[PDB]
């Protein structure tokens, strides 16, 4: 299968520089025009960079021209975006994208994206606290459990349960911004028979602080 995996994201000061990367696989990289397309907080999309298959010709909108440089290493199946003189407007989720080869001028594959946050604030790892019933009557057909993730910056974080094995019933609320820090909570409901009959675990990822964490949901 074709995939595109971006990295490089993180937090950076006004006027600073960052280099994003994109590892490509499952197709002949050499034969395809690549691009970066960014999605702003307000959820709008903007094409920021295009490079041809052999990497000879480039294009940029007026918004970023002079400041952004797209390049590709065809030997190492890798696409780059060099960024400079960062404005706050540049804050966005940055997607690495492939163009079709039939010159119908569309994007046929997008990665998961990496996030650029342009601010004076500081990268800060989350704390994770278990959400566990108590001090009240908790009985019967099911048990709802969770993780509360506080005090992180920039976004995003990801929460998984049992390294992905527990997908069903899981609810993960949007993150909320308060006094410069984000928080969220993830919850899963399961049969009362199965907890604490097994050990239940939440998996918390915060890439910008290169943080990965595991919490086991015990009782009492």
């Amino acid at each position: 299968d074709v995939k595109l995996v971006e990295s490089g994201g993180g937090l950076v000061k006004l006027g600073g520089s960052l280099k994003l990367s994109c590892a490509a696989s499952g197709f002949t990289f050499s034969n395809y025009f690549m691009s970066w397309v960014r999605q702003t907080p307000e959820k709008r999309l903007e094409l920021v960079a295009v490079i041809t298959s052999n990497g000879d010709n480039t294009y940029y909108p007026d918004t970023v021209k002079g400041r952004f440089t797209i390049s590709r290493d065809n030997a190492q199946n890798t696409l780059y975006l060099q960024m400079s003189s960062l404005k706050s407007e540049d804050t966005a989720l940055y997607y690495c994208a492939r163009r079709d080869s039939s010159a119908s001028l569309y994007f046929d594959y997008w990665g998961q994206g990496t996030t650029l946050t342009v601010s004076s604030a500081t990268t800060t790892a989350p704390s994770v606290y278990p959400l566990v019933p108590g001090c009240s009557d908790t009985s019967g057909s099911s048990v709802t459990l969770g993780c509360l993730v506080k005090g992180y910056f920039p976004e995003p974080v990801t929460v998984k349960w049992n390294y992905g094995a527990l997908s069903s019933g899981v609810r993960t609320v949007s993150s909320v911004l308060q006094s410069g820090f984000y928080s969220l909570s993830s919850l899963v409901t399961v049969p009362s028979s199965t907890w604490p009959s097994q050990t239940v675990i939440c998996n918390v990822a915060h890439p910008a602080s290169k943080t990965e964490l595991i919490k086991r949901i015990e009782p009492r």
Partner: protein
Amino acid sequence: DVVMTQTPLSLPVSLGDQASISCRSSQSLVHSNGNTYLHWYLQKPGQSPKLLIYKVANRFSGVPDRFSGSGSGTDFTLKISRVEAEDLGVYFCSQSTHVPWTFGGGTKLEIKRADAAPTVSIFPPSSEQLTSGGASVVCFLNNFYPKDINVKWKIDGSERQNGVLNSWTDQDSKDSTYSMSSTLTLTKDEYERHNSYTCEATHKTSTSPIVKSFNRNEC
């Protein structure tokens, strides 16, 4: 610079019912070669955008017959006949006839369904957080429709909103319900001066509230 304009900005429709998304362009999207480079992308909650339709009416491999695009010049529409639950997300039209390539700002396709009551769960703070000098009380409203809901907190009978943060999941792709959590964050010291902690939810699709509570002296 081609302004692409979509309406409606939000679209709710019921399962099996059809929906219609309009996309209008500042200028004509017919290239000097007669081809019209107008595409549609759907972006589901927490994913990249993925192509649905390219050049007005051509379904990308994988895309069912439910979806179809139509129109010319400056006026284009996308239609979804038996709207399924998995179809919710943000539909974007894009043109690449003129440089710079541009996107419409998107149309949120919400699902419509019968009203549904929250299962409410309330959570005392963890001893971990307590040890660090903090105390977040969480109240979780699971599986409800519509989106709108107020939750409030009462400490020893008396109301609180300072230090309260509310947050919703995206509409579920299977059940089309929503969930949300409200979090009251105190200091451990303030948490320990009171016994009774209560969250109360209302929404305007009930004339009553739903209440869930615990007592600290009962831990």
